[PDB]
């Protein structure tokens, strides 16, 4: 039973490792998107004010 | 004569605002050309992660 | 407007300050080299978040959904946010990124 439980325990640790790996890959893409969004805001909304 | 002084003061303040805003905007302009060593990115959006 | 320019100029000046990170020579046990404040602050803030994430991870594996552990989680997130914000206000973004590279 212990082996089965611990086999299941290992399965849980592996299923979690899979989720974390997927989660960290998504965060990397989100950071890249946030950097572009901030740059786009400065170019489209702030830089045009000095001329006005 | 008083209105001429006041007019100079008002022109100065208007120019100060123009200079102030130009200075302020210089902080937001990304130095395209790698070369210029000097302008250290102030913002993390400009940070080269 | 002048007040704002002064604030951004102060941040630029702070960003030009080279933060020296000590070379990880493995062997060399002891030398007590002092850890830069930015690296300390960033490490602490990252540790605090790590503990928080680890706690969520442990709870997911031990099926014992103890129903009382949510209020403590929030407080811990807020604490992290506040601390994180403080870090972003106290140090320059280039220094914070450098600290993250080193970590």
Swiss-Prot record, chain B:
Subunit structure: Component of the HAUS augmin-like complex. The complex interacts with the gamma-tubulin ring complex and this interaction is required for spindle assembly.
Described purpose of this protein according to its UniProt entry: Contributes to mitotic spindle assembly, maintenance of centrosome integrity and completion of cytokinesis as part of the HAUS augmin-like complex.
Taxonomic lineage of the native organism: Eukaryota, Metazoa, Chordata, Craniata, Vertebrata
Family per similarity comment: Belongs to the HAUS3 family.
Entry's localization field: Cytoplasm, Cytoskeleton, Microtubule organizing center, Centrosome; Cytoplasm, Cytoskeleton, Spindle
Protein name per its UniProtKB record: HAUS augmin-like complex subunit 3
